[PDB]
From Swiss-Prot, chain A:
<protein>
    <recommendedName>
        <fullName>Exosome complex component MTR3</fullName>
    </recommendedName>
</protein>
<dbReference type="GO" id="GO:0005654">
    <property type="term" value="C:nucleoplasm"/>
</dbReference>
<dbReference type="GO" id="GO:0071051">
    <property type="term" value="P:poly(A)-dependent snoRNA 3'-end processing"/>
</dbReference>
<dbReference type="GO" id="GO:0045190">
    <property type="term" value="P:isotype switching"/>
</dbReference>
<keyword id="KW-0698">rRNA processing</keyword>
Curated annotation (Swiss-Prot), chain B:
<dbReference type="GO" id="GO:0005634">
    <property type="term" value="C:nucleus"/>
</dbReference>
<dbReference type="GO" id="GO:0045006">
    <property type="term" value="P:DNA deamination"/>
</dbReference>
<dbReference type="InterPro" id="IPR050080">
    <property type="entry name" value="RNase_PH"/>
</dbReference>
<dbReference type="GO" id="GO:0000177">
    <property type="term" value="C:cytoplasmic exosome (RNase complex)"/>
</dbReference>
<dbReference type="GO" id="GO:0000956">
    <property type="term" value="P:nuclear-transcribed mRNA catabolic process"/>
</dbReference>
Swiss-Prot record, chain C:
<comment type="similarity">
    <text>Belongs to the CSL4 family.</text>
</comment>
<dbReference type="InterPro" id="IPR019495">
    <property type="entry name" value="EXOSC1_C"/>
</dbReference>
<dbReference type="GO" id="GO:0006364">
    <property type="term" value="P:rRNA processing"/>
</dbReference>
<dbReference type="GO" id="GO:0101019">
    <property type="term" value="C:nucleolar exosome (RNase complex)"/>
</dbReference>
<feature type="modified residue" description="Phosphoserine">
    <location>
        <position position="94"/>
    </location>
</feature>
Swiss-Prot record, chain F:
<keyword id="KW-0007">Acetylation</keyword>
<dbReference type="InterPro" id="IPR020568">
    <property type="entry name" value="Ribosomal_Su5_D2-typ_SF"/>
</dbReference>
<dbReference type="InterPro" id="IPR001247">
    <property type="entry name" value="ExoRNase_PH_dom1"/>
</dbReference>
<keyword id="KW-0539">Nucleus</keyword>
<dbReference type="InterPro" id="IPR015847">
    <property type="entry name" value="ExoRNase_PH_dom2"/>
</dbReference>
C-alpha cells in the first residue's frame, strides 16, 4: 500500500480481457504514408520552453525546465523524465512505472545528448519532462521530436534538430515495412523499429528496435525508409518554430 | 527425517562436535585490493575489500581520528530454493551490515588509516545454513589479502541445542527446526567475543554448553583458515624471491 | 527580417563570420537557435552574422554601473545580494552579488559595521567592480555618499525615512535605526 | 577472424616447479613475534599485554633492534624521494588533487609544478586560472614525492623538466609490492621505447623521442613499429605480474626477448604466460648465479 | 518591490492584468479529446490548465460494503507544470488536492457507489480518475473539480452480464450507458490579503504573496460541500456570505458552459 | 576515465588495426565458460571474459500464466549489479544499469521464437512454469552485454525442469505428481536463443569487445542480437554521441559474422562439457 | 537539527564515577528506574514510562487471507516508530540503523520465542485468519528503549481483546464489542528484554543506562528472559570484546529483574480489570 | 640504494648521524628518561676541551659506555674500509664534559647555579644548548619517521624543559 496516494483497491483488472471478439484488423494502406501532424511550440507559459505534438491518436507534451546550476568535466547535462499518463492505452498503470518509462527515457537522453551542445551549458542540468497523454502509434519518436522542439524553443543551443519515426512489420506472408503505424498495426505486429536523426548533417542520434523476427537486409531497408520519413517530416517542425517566434515578435 | 539419531550421528553424517569441510581461496578478483572465496559446506560466500581510500562527497563524515568502515551485505535471489527479491535494502541485510561493521571496526584496527573508507562487500551465492559465519570468515580472508592491519583472525561459527546436546556449525535443516541457534565470532588469541547473536527459546543452565561448543568450533575454523593463509603467503613469497 | 532554426546554414566563411549563437562546419556556418538572425557590417565590409532570441536579448552590468539589489544574507565579513535592476531595465535573470566590509564607504574606515549599515530585506544600489570567474559573483561597492540603502522596513512592517548619513527612523513611532543611508 | 572458448582449468599451486623451501619467518595476525627486553615495533605489528603481536600477513624482518613486517599486498605508502606517476582527480582553488594507489588523495601544490620553459618569477592569480587550462582533470603527471604529512597524505613536486606532464603513451596498474626498490626508474630501452616504473603500482610506457617538459602535446601519430613494441611490453608486464614476480629492466627486457616467437597477442594465454615467465626466471637465476 | 506594486492596483480596484477584483479569466473546456480513455476532459482558465482521464476497471469490494464501486482520484503536479516541483514522488500540494477531490466526491455524493455494483460480493466497478496539471498559474482546485465533473459526465460505460454455466462475466463494448450524476459541485477560490481584501481566482504571484487562501464548493440546490480554509488572517461571516453569493454565480456560469458543451456534441 | 593523449594513441592504433592488447578490430579474447556452478538452481552458468566475471542462476518455479498468454509460460529477469564490481554501486546506484540490462534481456525475448514457451505449459490458465533468471555482476571490464548473453544461453542450455502432472479433482482439490527420475528432466532448445554483440565506433572504424579504455574513447555503440541462423532480433544504439547511416550497415554485417562464429564455438564447448560428465569436478572459484 | 555534542568534562566525570561505582541520579548499577504502566480507554493501548522514557503501544486486528506456507496459523506485524518528539536527530528516514536493529531484535524476541499462539487465532484455514499488528511509538528518549518497547508490547498483547467471531462451515459472523464481550489473546509466557552497557572495553557493566551513559559506552548486551529462566534472544552490539563469565553473570541478573517486572505487569493488569469492574477507564502501576 | 636507516639519518644534519641511528636501533633511549637523552646528545654537540674532566654518576654514565661501544663498532667498520681514520680520536671527539651541567639545567635550575659547575665560559654553553635543541627537533622528526611516538614525545619534553629564561632570548637587533 502506497501512503502518498489515495487508498484504492488492491488489484483491478480491466474488462477487455473479459471480452469475446476478434478485434478488427486494419487491412491495406499505402506503406509509404504519413499521418497528419499538428506541431506547435510555445503552448505553456510557466515553462521556459514547451511543445505539443499530435499525430493521429498520439498526443504528447514536452516541457524544458531550463538551466539550473548543478572542458570535459564542466560539461552540461540533461536529465529526461518520460511519463505516459495513466489514462493512455487499453490498460491502466499506476503513475510510477519503473519498467518501460525508464527505457524510453534512456532512449531520449541518448538521442538528445548528440544534437544539444553542452559545452555552452556547464555546471548545469536541463530538466526535460515529456508526457504522453494518448498512445496511438509511434510514441518514442513523437517524444523525441517534441523534446527537440521544446529545447529549440527555450533557446538552448544545438547543432540540428531531432526527427523521429516509428516503423512496424506486417506479419503477412509478404512482410512489408509499415511506416508511422497505429496502436493496432503495432500490437498486431511482428517487429518494431524507431529511428531518430539530424537531417541536415544526416546522422542518426538514437535508434531502437525489436522483432518476432527479421534479417539484415530487411532491417536495412527499414532504416533507410525511416530516414526518408523523417526527412519528409522536418519542414513541418521548421514552420512551427518560425510561427512561435513570430508570435513572440508580436507580443512585443 | 531426524536430527540426532540415538547413536550420535546427524543427517549429513557427522557427529555433534565436528563440522563440514571448508574449502576456500584468496585472490579471486584482481581488479580489487582484496578478495576471497569460501564454501563452508554447500554455502558459498564471496567477499571483497576496496582498501583504505579517499572519501568522496565528503558530506562531513570523514572521521579524523580513525577510519570509516562501510560493509554491505547481500543474499542472492537464487541463494535459497524459494526465490526472493530485493536482496539489498531489506530490513535484514542492513542488520547484517551493522553486525559485520561493529565486528570489523573492533578488529580491523582503524587507528592507523584516519579519514579513509574501508569498503567491505559480501555476496552470498548459496545458503544451506550458517550464512553469517561464512561471510564473516570470507571478509576476514579478504581483509588479510588486502594487507589491512587487523588484530587477529576474527573467526565465527554457529552452534545449536538438540536432545540435551550441543551441535556445531548447523545446517538449514536443523536451522529450520526452530531450535536455539547461537552464532558468534571471537578473536582466538585473547579468547574475546566480537559478536554474539542468538535466536530461540531455551533454559539458562543450557547456555554454557552451547557457548563453549561454538567457541571450540570457531577454534577449529581458525586452524583451517590459518593453514590456508599460510599456504597462500608461502607460495607468494616463494614466487617473489 | 527572417527567423532561423538550429540546423539551417546561413553563409560561407567567405561571406560572413560567426558572432554568436552559431557554429561552423566545412566551408559553412550553421545556426544554433530558434530566433532572428542579423549580419552587422564593419567599415571592413566583412559581415558578422549572429542569431538572437530577443525574448531576453542580452544584458551586461559593467564596472561603471549603478545597479540596485536586495540584501538577503549578511555576515561580519560580507553581505550577499540579488540583482534586480541594472540601471532601470529589470532583468528576470536575477544575478547574485556581494558587498565587502571595507568596500562600503568612501572613507574606507575599518570602523564600519555591517549590522549598522545593512540589514536583510532592504534595497540598495551600488557600483559593480568584479564580474567574477567561477560563479560570476558580482562584487558591489558603495564607496560614495549618494549610495547604499534607499528603502528599509522597520522593526516589523513600517518603511523608514533616510534622516541622516547613518540614521533612519519610522514616521509613525520613533526609533533610530542605523544604516548606510544613501544621499 | 578467430574466436575461442575454453573451460577453466584448475590451478597448480605450491609453485613446486621451483622447490625453494624459503628461509624466512612468515606470520599472520595473532602470531607472537619474539618477546624480549625492549624491542621496537615498526609497520606491521602492535603490542598487547607485554607481547609483540603481528597485525598483517607476511614475512617478519628484524633490523638490528627494530621488528617490522613486509606484507605482500598494500597500497603505496609515501616515501620522500620515490618517483611516482599519478592521475589527477580534482582541481582546487589552491592546488591539484591526484590519485595514486595510496590510502588518501595525493596533493600537488600550485607552487610545485614547473612553468613553461624556465619562466620562474612567482605564482599569482593568473597562474591560479591557468591552473586548469594546462593540467586538465584526468591527466597524468610523473613526479617525485616532496614530503609526507602527519595525516598520511603525500605532497609531491617536480624537481626538473624530466618530470611533469606526460605524452600519449600507455599505462598499466600493478601492485606496488612488485617493483624492486632501486634507482633510475626512468628507463629508455633499446627495443624502441621507454618506461617509467613508479614506486607505486603505476607503470607508464611511452615511445622514446630523439631530441631530449610536457608543456606541449605532441599529438602526432606513432609508427606501427613503435606501437607493437609498446603493446608487447604491456602484455609482458601483465604476464610477469600475473605470476607474482618482481619487475625491473632486465625482467621486462628478457620477457620481451622471449615473446618474439609467440606473437603479440597469444602471450596472455596462461600456458604461454607461464612458459615465458619460467624461461625468464630461470635465465635470470642462472646468469646472476 | 512586488507587494507595493500590487497594492497600488488593489487600491485602484483592479489588478495588473485587467480584472476587476471579483471576476475570473477566460474559462474553456474540451470533451472527448481522448479515445484510449473512457472519459476525458480538458479544462483551462487562461494560462492554468488541467486534464482528467477517467478509466474504468473491475474489482472486488470490501466486506463492510459489497455494493460500492470505488472512485479513486489522483492529482499529478509534474515538474513541467512549474519549477517549484521536482521529478520524483508526489509532494504535498498534490496530496492535499487529492484528498480535497476525494472529500468532494464523498460528500457532494455526485455519484452513488451502489450504481457501480454488478454482482455484489464478487465484482464492482472502480473508476480511476487521474487528473494532471499542466500550467500552475493558480487556482488549481477549481480547474481540477470542473475537469473531474466534465469527464465524469462524458464517461459512458459498457454493459456486462453473468453466465452461471461459466461462472464468469462478459462485456458488450458495443452497447454502453452513461453515468448518472445528481449534484454538480463547482468550486470557487479566494485569496485574503492582510485583513479584509478578498480577490477571486488568484493567480500564482497573488497566492505567493497572500496572507491566506480559501475555497468553497457550492452545490446547485443552495448547499455547500466543502469550505477549505487553510490558515489565514481571519474572517467574519460578513466577509463570507459575499463569497458564497459569488460562488453561486460561478456555479450558474460554469454549469451553463458545460451544458452548452455537452449539447454541442 | 583517462586523458586525451591516451585517447589519441588508442584511436590511431585502431585506425592502424592494432590495439594495446596487440589484437585487431574483429578479435575477442579467451572467454572462460563454465556451467553447473551452483547446485540449488535448476540451471546455472559462469563467464570470465578478460576481467569481467558474471554469474547466472536460473530457477524454474511454478506460477500462474499470463492472462493474455495462458497457453505458455514466461521468462523473468533480475540483475544484481553487486557493488563488488566498482564501489560506486550501492543499494541505489546500480539500479540504473541493472534496469537497463534487464530491459534489454526482455527485448531479446519478446520474440516468440527463441524459447518455445508452449513446452513450459502444464494446464492452461491453471498452472505453468516460470523461468526466473538472475544475473549477478562481479566485475566490469567491458563487453558486458555479450558476456551476459552468453551466460544466459549457457544457463538455459544447462537448465533441467522436472516433469509434473497436475491432476484436477472436484470440490477444488488439486494434486501434483512428480517423476522420481532426476535423470528424466526435460531440456529446452536454445538453437534460437541469441547472443548480443556490442560494436563500438572509434574514429572511423568499428570494434568488438570494446574494453573500457576504448569505450571512453568512443562516441557510439550499436548492440545487435543475432541467432546462429543469421537473423537480427534486436538492434539498439547506446552512447552520448552520434552515428552515421552508412556505418550502421557495416556494423550489422560484422555482427552477423561474429554471431555465427560465437554460437558455433559456444555450442561446441558446451557439448564437450556435457559429454565429459562429473569427471570434470566443476572447478569454480578455487 | 542535531544532537548537542558531548563535552569532555561530562565524559571524564562519568567514567570516573563508574570507576567508583556511582551513578548520577543516585541508584546502584543493578537497578532500573521507577517504571510506570498506565492504560488507556481502548483495550490494547498502553503508555509505559520508565523514568523519563515514555513509549506508547497500540494493538490492532484485522482479518485477511493468510500466506500459503502457513494456512493454519495467523500473522503478527510489529512496527516501532521513533517520533521526532523523542529527540531532534530522529528525522524521518535518517536514523535508520537504530530502527532496523530495534525492530529486528523485537520481532525475533517476541515472534520466534512463540510468546503468543498464532494458531488459536485461525478462523478459516486457507481463506481468512486474524492479523495482529502492534505499533510502538517513542515519545520521550531518555536512555533505555528495548526494555520500554518490550514492556509496552507485552502489556498491550496481554491487555487486548478481539471481536468475538462465530463460524459454521464457511459462514463467518463477526460481531461488535457491544453485541458480545471481546475475547482476549493467548499468551504462553511474557518475555521482556534487559539491557546491559559496557564501559572500558568490558571492565564495567551497568543496567538501564541513561542517554549520556549510552553516549559514553562502547558496547550493549541485550538479553531476553522469562519468569521461567528461558533465554529467548541475546545480542551484542557496539563492537566490543566481552567474555563468557560476563554474559553468565548478566543472565543471572536478568533472571531476578524479569521476575520482578513480570510481577508488576500482572499486578497492573489485575488493577485495570478491577477498575473497569467498578467504573473507570484507566489503570496505573508503579515500580 | 637507500635503506630505512638512511631515511632516518637524512633527517639529521647537526651531528654524527650514523652513531645516532645506531643508538636508536640498538635500544638506548627506549629505557632512559627525558633528560638523560639530552645529556647523551650534549656528549655530541659539545666539542671544546676543559681543564677537569667531571665525575658522573652511574645512572648518567652507564649509557655513555654503550654509546662508546657503538662508537667502537663504527670505528672498526670504518677501519675495515681504510678511511685513514683513528679510533681514539673519533671516540673522544665526543666530550661529555657538560652532561651534569645539562642535567641540572633540565631539572629547572638557575644559570648561576650552572656557570659554576664547569670552568668553561658561558657563550660556549649557550651554543651547546642551542645546537642541542636543534638536534632534539631533528631527533623528534627521526622518531616520527620510523614510527615510534614515546621517543619523540620524550625529546619534545626535553626541549620544553630546556627553554626557560636566557639561553633562547631575543636578538636586540630584532
Amino acid at each position: 500500500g502506497d501512503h502518498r496516494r489515495i487508498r484504492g483497491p488492491e488489484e483491478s483488472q480491466p474488462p477487455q480481457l473479459y471480452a469475446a471478439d476478434e478485434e478488427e484488423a486494419p487491412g491495406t494502406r499505402d506503406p509509404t504514408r504519413l499521418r497528419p501532424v499538428y506541431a506547435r511550440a510555445g503552448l505553456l507559459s510557466q515553462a521556459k520552453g514547451s511543445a505539443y505534438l499530435e499525430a493521429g491518436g498520439t498526443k504528447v507534451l514536452c516541457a524544458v525546465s531550463g538551466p539550473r546550476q548543478a572542458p570535459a568535466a564542466l560539461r552540461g547535462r540533461l536529465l529526461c523524465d518520460f511519463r505516459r499518463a495513466p489514462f493512455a492505452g487499453r490498460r491502466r498503470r499506476a503513475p510510477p512505472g519503473g519498467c518501460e518509462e525508464r527505457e524510453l527515457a534512456l532512449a531520449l537522453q541518448e538521442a538528445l545528448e548528440p544534437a544539444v551542445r553542452l559545452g555552452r551549458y556547464p555546471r548545469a542540468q536541463l530538466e526535460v519532462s515529456a508526457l504522453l497523454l494518448e498512445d496511438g502509434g509511434s510514441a518514442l519518436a513523437a517524444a523525441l521530436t517534441a523534446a527537440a522542439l521544446a529545447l529549440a524553443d527555450a533557446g538552448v543551443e544545438m547543432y540540428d534538430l531531432v526527427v523521429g519515426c516509428g516503423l512496424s512489420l506486417a506479419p503477412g506472408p509478404a512482410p512489408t515495412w509499415l511506416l508511422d503505424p497505429t496502436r493496432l498495426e503495432e500490437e498486431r505486429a511482428a517487429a518494431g523499429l524507431t529511428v531518430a536523426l539530424m537531417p541536415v548533417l544526416n546522422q542518426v542520434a538514437g535508434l531502437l528496435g525489436s522483432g518476432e523476427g527479421g534479417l539484415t537486409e530487411s532491417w536495412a531497408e527499414a532504416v533507410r525508409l525511416g530516414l526518408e520519413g523523417c526527412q519528409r517530416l522536418y519542414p513541418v517542425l521548421q514552420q512551427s518554430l518560425v510561427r512561435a517566434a513570430r508570435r513572440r515578435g508580436a507580443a512585443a | 527425517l531426524e536430527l540426532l539419531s540415538d547413536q550420535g550421528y546427524r543427517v549429513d553424517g557427522r557427529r555433534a562436535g565436528e563440522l563440514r569441510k571448508i574449502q576456500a581461496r584468496m585472490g579471486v578478483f584482481a581488479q580489487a585490493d582484496g578478495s576471497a572465496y569460501i564454501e563452508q559446506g554447500n554455502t558459498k560466500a564471496l567477499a571483497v575489500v576496496y582498501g583504505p581510500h579517499e572519501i568522496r562527497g565528503s558530506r562531513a563524515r570523514a572521521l579524523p581520528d580513525r577510519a570509516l568502515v562501510n560493509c554491505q551485505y547481500s543474499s542472492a535471489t537464487f541463494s535459497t530454493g524459494e526465490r526472493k527479491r530485493r536482496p539489498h535494502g531489506d530490513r535484514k541485510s542492513c542488520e547484517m551490515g551493522l553486525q559485520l561493521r561493529q565486528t570489523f571496526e573492533a578488529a580491523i584496527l582503524t587507528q592507523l588509516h584516519p579519514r579513509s573508507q574501508i569498503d567491505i562487500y559480501v555476496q552470498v551465492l548459496q545458503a544451506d545454513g550458517g550464512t553469517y559465519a561464512a561471510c564473516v570468515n570470507a571478509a576476514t580472508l579478504a581483509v588479510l589479502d588486502a594487507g589491512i592491519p587487523m588484530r587477529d583472525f576474527v573467526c565465527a561459527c554457529s552452534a545449536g541445542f538438540v536432545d540435551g546436546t550441543a551441535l556445531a556449525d548447523l545446517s538449514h535443516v536443523e536451522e529450520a527446526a526452530g531450535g536455539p541457534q547461537l552464532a558468534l565470532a571471537l578473536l582466538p588469541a585473547s579468547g574475546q567475543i566480537a559478536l554474539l547473536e542468538m535466536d530461540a527459546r531455551l533454559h539458562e543452565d543450557h547456555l554454557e554448553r552451547v557457548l563453549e561448543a561454538a567457541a571450540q568450533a570457531a577454534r577449529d575454523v581458525h586452524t583451517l583458515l590459518d593453514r590456508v593463509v599460510r599456504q597462500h603467503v608461502r607460495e607468494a613469497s616463494i614466487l617473489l624471491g | 527580417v527572417r527567423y532561423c532554426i538550429p540546423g539551417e546554414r546561413l553563409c560561407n566563411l567567405e561571406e560572413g563570420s560567426p558572432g554568436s549563437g552559431t557554429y561552423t562546419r566545412h566551408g559553412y556556418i550553421f545556426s544554433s537557435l530558434a530566433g532572428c538572425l542579423m549580419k552587422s557590417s564593419e567599415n571592413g565590409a566583412l559581415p558578422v552574422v549572429s542569431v538572437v532570441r530577443e525574448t531576453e536579448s542580452q544584458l551586461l552590468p559593467d564596472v561603471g554601473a549603478i545597479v540596485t539589489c536586495k540584501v538577503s544574507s549578511i555576515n561580519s565579513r560580507f553581505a550577499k545580494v540579488h540583482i534586480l535592476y541594472v540601471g532601470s531595465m529589470p532583468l528576470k535573470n536575477s544575478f547574485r552579488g556581494t558587498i565587502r566590509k571595507e568596500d562600503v564607504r568612501a572613507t574606507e574606515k575599518d570602523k564600519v559595521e555591517i549590522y549598522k549599515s545593512f540589514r536583510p530585506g532592504d534595497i540598495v544600489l551600488a557600483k559593480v567592480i568584479s564580474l567574477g570567474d567561477a560563479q560570476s559573483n558580482y562584487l558591489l561597492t558603495t564607496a560614495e555618499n549618494e549610495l547604499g540603502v534607499v528603502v528599509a522596513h522597520s522593526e516589523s512592517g513600517i518603511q523608514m525615512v533616510p534622516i541622516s548619513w547613518c540614521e533612519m527612523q519610522c514616521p509613525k513611532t520613533h526609533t533610530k535605526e542605523f544604516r548606510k543611508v544613501a544621499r | 577472424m578467430a574466436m575461442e572458448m575454453r573451460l577453466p582449468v584448475a590451478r597448480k599451486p605450491l609453485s613446486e616447479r621451483l622447490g625453494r623451501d624459503t628461509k624466512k619467518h612468515l606470520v599472520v595476525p595473532g602470531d607472537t613475534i619474539t618477546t624480549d627486553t625492549g624491542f621496537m615495533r615498526g609497520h606491521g605489528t602492535y603490542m598487547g599485554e607485554e607481547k609483540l603481536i603481528a597485525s598483517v600477513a607476511g614475512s617478519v624482518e628484524r633490523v638490528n633492534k627494530l621488528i617490522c613486517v613486509k606484507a605482500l599486498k598494500t597500497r603505496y605508502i609515501g616515501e620522500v624521494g620515490d618517483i611516482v606517476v599519478g592521475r589527477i582527480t580534482e582541481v582546487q582553488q589552491k592546488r591539484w588533487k591526484v590519485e595514486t594507489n595510496s590510502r588518501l588523495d595525493s596533493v600537488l601544490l600550485l607552487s610545485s609544478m614547473n612553468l613553461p620553459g624556465g619562466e620562474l618569477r612567482r605564482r599569482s592569480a593568473e597562474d591560479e586560472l591557468a591552473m586548469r587550462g594546462f593540467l586538465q582533470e584526468g591527466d597524468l603527471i610523473s613526479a617525485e614525492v616532496q614530503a609526507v604529512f602527519s595525516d598520511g597524505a603525500v605532497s609531491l613536486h617536480t624537481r626538473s623538466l624530466k618530470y611533469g606532464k606526460l605524452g600519449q603513451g600507455v599505462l598499466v596498474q600493478v601492485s606496488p609490492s612488485l617493483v624492486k626498490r632501486q634507482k633510475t626508474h626512468f628507463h629508455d630501452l633499446p627495443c624502441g621505447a621507454s618506461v617509467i616504473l613508479g614506486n607505486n603500482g603505476f607503470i607508464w610506457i611511452y615511445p622514446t623521442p630523439e631530441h631530449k617538459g610536457g608543456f606541449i602535446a605532441n599529438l602526432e601519430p606513432v609508427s606501427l613499429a613503435d606501437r607493437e613494441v609498446i603493446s608487447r611490453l604491456r602484455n609482458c608486464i601483465i604476464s610477469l605480474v600475473t605470476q607474482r614476480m618482481m619487475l625491473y629492466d632486465t625482467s621486462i627486457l628478457y620477457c620481451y626477448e622471449a615473446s618474439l616467437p609467440h606473437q603479440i597477442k597469444d602471450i596472455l594465454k596462461p600456458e604461454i604466460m607461464e612458459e615465458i615467465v619460467m624461461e625468464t626466471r630461470q635465465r635470470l637465476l642462472e646468469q646472476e648465479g | 518591490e512586488p507587494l507595493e506594486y500590487y497594492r497600488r492596483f488593489l487600491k485602484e480596484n483592479c489588478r495588473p492584468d485587467g480584472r476587476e477584483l471579483g471576476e475570473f479569466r477566460t474559462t474553456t473546456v474540451n470533451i472527448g479529446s481522448i479515445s484510449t480513455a473512457d472519459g476525458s476532459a480538458l479544462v483551462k482558465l487562461g494560462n492554468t490548465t488541467v486534464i482528467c482521464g477517467v478509466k474504468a476497471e473491475f474489482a472486488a469490494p470490501s466486506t463492510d460494503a459489497p455494493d460500492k464501486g470505488y472512485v479513486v482520484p489522483n492529482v499529478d503536479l509534474p515538474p513541467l507544470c512549474s519549477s517549484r516541483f521536482r521529478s520524483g514522488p508526489p509532494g504535498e500540494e498534490a496530496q492535499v488536492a487529492s484528498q480535497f477531490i476525494a472529500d468532494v466526491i464523498e460528500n457532494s455524493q455526485i455519484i452513488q457507489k451502489e450504481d457501480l455494483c454488478i454482482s455484489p460480493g464478487k465484482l464492482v466497478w472502480v473508476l480511476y480518475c487521474d487528473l494532471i496539471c499542466l500550467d500552475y498559474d493558480g487556482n488549481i482546485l477549481d480547474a481540477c473539480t470542473f475537469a473531474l465533473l466534465a469527464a465524469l459526465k462524458n464517461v459512458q460505460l459498457p454493459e456486462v452480464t453473468i453466465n452461471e454455466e461459466t461462472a464468469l462475466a462478459e462485456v458488450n463494448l458495443k452497447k454502453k450507458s452513461y453515468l448518472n450524476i445528481r449534484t454538480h459541485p463547482v468550486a470557487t477560490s479566494f485569496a485574503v490579503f492582510d485583513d479584509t481584501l478578498l480577490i477571486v481566482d488568484p493567480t500564482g504571484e497573488e497566492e505567493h504573496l497572500a496572507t491566506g487562501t480559501l475555497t468553497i464548493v457550492m452545490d446547485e440546490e443552495g448547499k455547500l460541500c466543502c469550505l477549505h480554509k487553510p490558515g489565514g488572517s481571519g474572517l467574519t461571516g460578513a466577509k463570507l456570505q459575499d463569497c458564497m453569493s459569488r460562488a453561486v454565480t460561478r456555479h450558474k456560469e460554469v454549469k451553463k458552459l458545460m451544458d452548452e458543451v455537452i449539447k454541442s456534441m | 576515465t583517462l586523458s586525451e593523449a591516451e585517447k589519441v594513441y588508442i584511436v590511431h592504433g585502431v585506425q592502424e588495426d592494432l590495439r594495446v592488447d596487440g589484437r585487431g578490430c574483429e578479435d575477442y579474447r579467451c572467454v572462460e565458460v563454465e556451467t553447473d556452478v551452483v547446485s540449488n538452481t535448476s540451471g546455472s552458468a559462469r563467464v570470465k571474459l578478460g576481467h569481467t566475471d558474471i554469474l547466472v542462476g536460473v530457477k524454474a518455479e511454478m506460477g500462474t500464466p499470463k492472462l493474455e498468454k495462458p497457453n505458455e509460460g514466461y521468462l523473468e529477469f533480475f540483475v544484481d549489479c553487486s557493488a563488488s564490481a566498482t564501489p560506486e554501486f550501492e543499494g541505489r546506484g546500480g539500479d540504473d544499469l541493472g534496469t537497463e540490462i534487464a530491459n534489454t534481456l526482455y527485448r531479446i525475448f519478446n520474440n516468440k521464437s527463441s524459447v518455445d514457451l508452449k513446452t513450459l505449459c502444464i494446464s492452461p490458465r491453471e498452472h505453468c512454469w516460470v523461468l526466473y533468471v538472475d544475473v549477478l555482476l562481479l566485475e566490469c571490464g567491458g563487453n558486458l552485454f555479450d558476456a551476459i548473453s552468453i551466460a544466459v544461453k549457457a544457463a538455459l542450455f544447462n537448465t533441467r525442469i522436472p516433469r509434473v502432472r497436475v491432476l484436477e479433482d472436484e470440490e477444488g482439490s488439486k494434486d501434483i505428481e512428480l517423476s522420481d527420475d532426476p535423470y528424466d528432466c526435460i531440456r529446452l532448445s536454445v538453437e534460437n536463443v541469441p547472443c548480443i554483440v556490442t560494436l563500438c565506433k572509434i574514429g572511423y572504424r568499428h570494434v568488438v569487445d570494446a574494453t573500457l579504455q576504448e569505450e571512453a574513447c568512443s562516441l557510439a555503440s550499436l548492440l545487435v542480437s543475432v541467432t546462429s541462423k543469421g537473423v537480427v532480433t534486436c538492434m539498439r544504439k547506446v552512447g552520448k554521441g552520434s552515428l552515421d547511416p552508412e556505418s550502421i550497415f557495416e556494423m550489422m554485417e560484422t555482427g552477423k559474422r561474429v554471431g555465427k562464429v560465437l554460437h558455433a564455438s559456444l555450442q561446441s564447448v558446451v557439448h564437450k562439457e556435457e559429454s565429459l560428465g562429473p569427471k570434470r569436478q566443476k572447478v569454480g572459484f578455487l | 537539527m542535531k544532537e548537542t555534542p558531548l563535552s569532555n568534562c561530562e565524559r571524564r566525570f562519568l567514567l570516573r564515577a563508574i570507576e567508583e561505582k556511582k551513578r548520577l541520579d543516585g541508584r546502584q548499577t543493578y537497578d532500573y528506574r521507577n517504571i510506570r504502566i498506565s492504560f488507556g480507554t481502548d483495550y490494547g493501548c498502553c503508555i509505559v514510562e520508565l523514568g523519563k522514557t515514555r513509549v506508547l503501544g497500540q494493538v490492532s486486528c484485522e482479518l485477511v487471507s493468510p500466506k500459503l506456507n502457513r494456512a493454519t496459523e495467523g500473522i503478527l506485524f510489529f512496527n516501532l516508530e521513533l517520533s521526532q518528539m523523542a529527540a531532534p536527530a530522529f528525522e524521518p528516514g535518517r536514523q535508520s540503523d537504530l530502527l532496523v536493529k530495534l525492530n529486528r531484535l523485537m520481532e525475533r524476541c517476541l515472534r520466534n520465542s512463540k510468546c503468543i499462539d498464532t494458531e488459536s487465532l485461525c478462523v478459516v484455514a486457507g481463506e481468512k485468519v486474524w492479523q495482529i499488528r502492534v505499533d510502538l511509538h517513542l515519545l520521550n528518549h531518555d536512555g533505555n528503549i528495548i526494555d520500554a518497547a518490550s514492556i509496552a508490547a507485552i502489556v498491550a498483547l496481554c491487555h487486548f481483546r478481539r471481536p468475538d467471531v462465530s463460524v459454521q462451515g464457511d459462514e463467518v459472523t463477526l460481531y461488535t464489542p457491544e453485541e458480545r464481550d471481546p475475547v482476549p489473546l493467548s499468551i504462553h509466557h511474557m518475555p521482556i528484554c534487559v539491557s546491559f552497557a559496557f564501559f572500558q572495553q568490558g571492565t564495567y557493566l551497568l543496567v538501564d543506562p541513561n542517554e549520556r551513559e549510552e553516549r559514553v559506552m562502547d558496547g550493549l548486551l541485550v538479553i531476553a528472559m522469562n519468569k521461567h529462566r528461558e533465554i529467548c534472544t541475546i545480542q551484542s552490539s557496539g563492537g566490543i570484546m566481552l567474555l563468557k563469565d560476563q554474559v553468565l553473570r548478566c543472565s543471572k541478573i536478568a533472571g531476578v529483574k524479569v521476575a520482578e517486572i513480570t510481577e508488576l505487569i500482572l499486578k497492573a493488569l489485575e488493577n485495570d480489570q478491577k477498575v473497569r469492574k467498578e467504573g473507570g477507564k484507566f489503570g496505573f502501576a508503579e515500580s | 640504494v637507500i635503506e630505512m636507516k638512511g631515511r632516518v639519518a637524512c633527517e639529521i644534519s647537526s651531528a654524527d648521524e650514523l652513531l645516532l641511528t645506531e643508538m636508536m636501533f640498538n635500544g638506548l633511549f627506549n629505557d632512559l628518561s627525558a633528560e638523560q637523552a639530552t645529556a647523551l646528545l650534549s656528549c655530541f654537540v659539545f666539542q671544546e676541551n676543559s681543564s677537569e674532566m667531571p665525575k658522573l654518576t652511574e645512572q648518567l654514565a652507564g649509557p655513555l659506555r654503550q654509546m662508546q661501544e657503538c662508537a667502537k663498532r663504527i670505528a672498526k667498520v670504518s677501519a675495515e674500509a681504510k678511511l685513514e681514520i683513528d679510533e681514539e680520536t673519533y671516540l673522544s671527539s665526543f666530550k661529555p664534559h657538560l652532561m651534569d651541567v645539562v642535567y641540572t639545567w633540565a631539572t629547572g635550575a638557575t644559570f648561576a647555579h650552572i656557570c659554576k659547575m664547569t670552568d668553561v665560559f658561558e657563550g660556549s654553553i649557550i651554543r651547546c644548548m642551542r645546537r642541542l635543541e636543534e638536534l632534539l627537533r631533528q631527533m623528534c622528526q627521526a622518531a616520527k619517521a620510523i614510527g615510534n611516538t614515546e621517543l619523540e614525545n620524550k625529546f619534545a619534553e626535553g626541549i620544553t624543559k630546556i627553554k626557560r629564561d636566557i639561553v633562547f632570548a631575543a636578538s636586540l637587533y630584532l
